[PDB]
Amino acid sequence: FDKMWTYMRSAEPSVFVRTTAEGVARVRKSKGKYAYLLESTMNEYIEQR
Amino acid sequence: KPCDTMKVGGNLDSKGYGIATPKGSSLRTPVNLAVLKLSEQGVLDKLKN
């Protein structure tokens, strides 16, 4: 996780998103070149949408 | 130009550039305060841009 943080905090463009919906859309539009770390609850909900 | 180089990956560390004076210099306090004033008034961002 420290290795992942080292990468995420310095990644350009920013890998951080303002809202959950923004992260979900970035995953959906990035053709698998963007993975999103989020709480299992939101993940499970979006998986059924 | 010739635009043939590229920055790849994130930064390996995080640090800063500072205005330096001889140890114990009379200018140390005014120059430290001026850098903070130039920071707070947005001068440093304008000059980098």
UniProtKB/Swiss-Prot annotation, chain A:
- Where on the chain is Phosphoserine found, per UniProt? S30
Q: How is it modified after translation?
A: Palmitoylated. Depalmitoylated upon L-glutamate stimulation. Ubiquitinated by RNF167, leading to its degradation.
Compartments in which it is found: Cell membrane; Postsynaptic cell membrane; Postsynaptic density membrane
Positions the record marks as coiled coil are none
**Tissue note:** Detected in forebrain. Detected in dendrites of neuronal cells. Expressed in the pyramidal cell layers of CA1 and CA3 and in the granule cell layer of the dentate gyrus.
Family membership, please give it: Belongs to the glutamate-gated ion channel (TC 1.A.10.1) family. GRIA2 subfamily.
Assembly and partners? Homotetramer or heterotetramer of pore-forming glutamate receptor subunits. Tetramers may be formed by the dimerization of dimers. May interact with MPP4. Forms a ternary complex with GRIP1 and CSPG4. Interacts with ATAD1 in an ATP-dependent manner. ATAD1-catalyzed ATP hydrolysis disrupts binding to ATAD1 and to GRIP1 and leads to AMPAR complex disassembly. Interacts with GRIP2. Interacts with GRIP1. Interacts with NSF via its C-terminus. Interacts with CACNG2, PICK1 and GRIP2. Interacts with GRIA1 and SYNDIG1. Part of a complex containing GRIA2, NSF and NAPA and/or NAPB.
Purpose of the protein: Ionotropic glutamate receptor that functions as a ligand-gated cation channel, gated by L-glutamate and glutamatergic agonists such as alpha-amino-3-hydroxy-5-methyl-4-isoxazolepropionic acid (AMPA), quisqualic acid, and kainic acid. L-glutamate acts as an excitatory neurotransmitter at many synapses in the central nervous system and plays an important role in fast excitatory synaptic transmission.
Q: What is this protein called?
A: Glutamate receptor 2
What lineage is on file? Answer: Eukaryota, Metazoa, Chordata, Craniata, Vertebrata
Section of the entire sequence shown: 688 to 736 of 883
Curated annotation (Swiss-Prot), chain B:
Tissue specificity, please? Answer: Detected in forebrain. Detected in dendrites of neuronal cells. Expressed in the pyramidal cell layers of CA1 and CA3 and in the granule cell layer of the dentate gyrus.
Top-rank taxon of the source lineage equals Eukaryota
Cell location? Cell membrane; Postsynaptic cell membrane; Postsynaptic density membrane
Residues carrying the site annotation Interaction with the cone snail toxin Con-ikot-ikot: K37
Induction of its expression: Down-regulated in the pyramidal cell layer of CA1 in the hippocampus by global ischemia.
Q: How is it modified after translation?
A: Palmitoylated. Depalmitoylated upon L-glutamate stimulation. Ubiquitinated by RNF167, leading to its degradation.
The entry sums up its family as follows:
Belongs to the glutamate-gated ion channel (TC 1.A.10.1) family. GRIA2 subfamily.
Question: What is the protein's known function?
Answer: Ionotropic glutamate receptor that functions as a ligand-gated cation channel, gated by L-glutamate and glutamatergic agonists such as alpha-amino-3-hydroxy-5-methyl-4-isoxazolepropionic acid (AMPA), quisqualic acid, and kainic acid. L-glutamate acts as an excitatory neurotransmitter at many synapses in the central nervous system and plays an important role in fast excitatory synaptic transmission.
What's the subunit arrangement here?
Homotetramer or heterotetramer of pore-forming glutamate receptor subunits. Tetramers may be formed by the dimerization of dimers. May interact with MPP4. Forms a ternary complex with GRIP1 and CSPG4. Interacts with ATAD1 in an ATP-dependent manner. ATAD1-catalyzed ATP hydrolysis disrupts binding to ATAD1 and to GRIP1 and leads to AMPAR complex disassembly. Interacts with GRIP2. Interacts with GRIP1. Interacts with NSF via its C-terminus. Interacts with CACNG2, PICK1 and GRIP2. Interacts with GRIA1 and SYNDIG1. Part of a complex containing GRIA2, NSF and NAPA and/or NAPB.
> Domain comment, in the record's words?
The M4 transmembrane segment mediates tetramerization and is required for cell surface expression.
Share any extra remarks.
The postsynaptic actions of L-glutamate are mediated by a variety of receptors that are named according to their selective agonists. This receptor binds AMPA (quisqualate) > L-glutamate > kainate.
- The name this protein carries in UniProt is Glutamate receptor 2
The source organism is Rattus norvegicus (Rat)
Q: Which gene encodes it?
A: Gria2
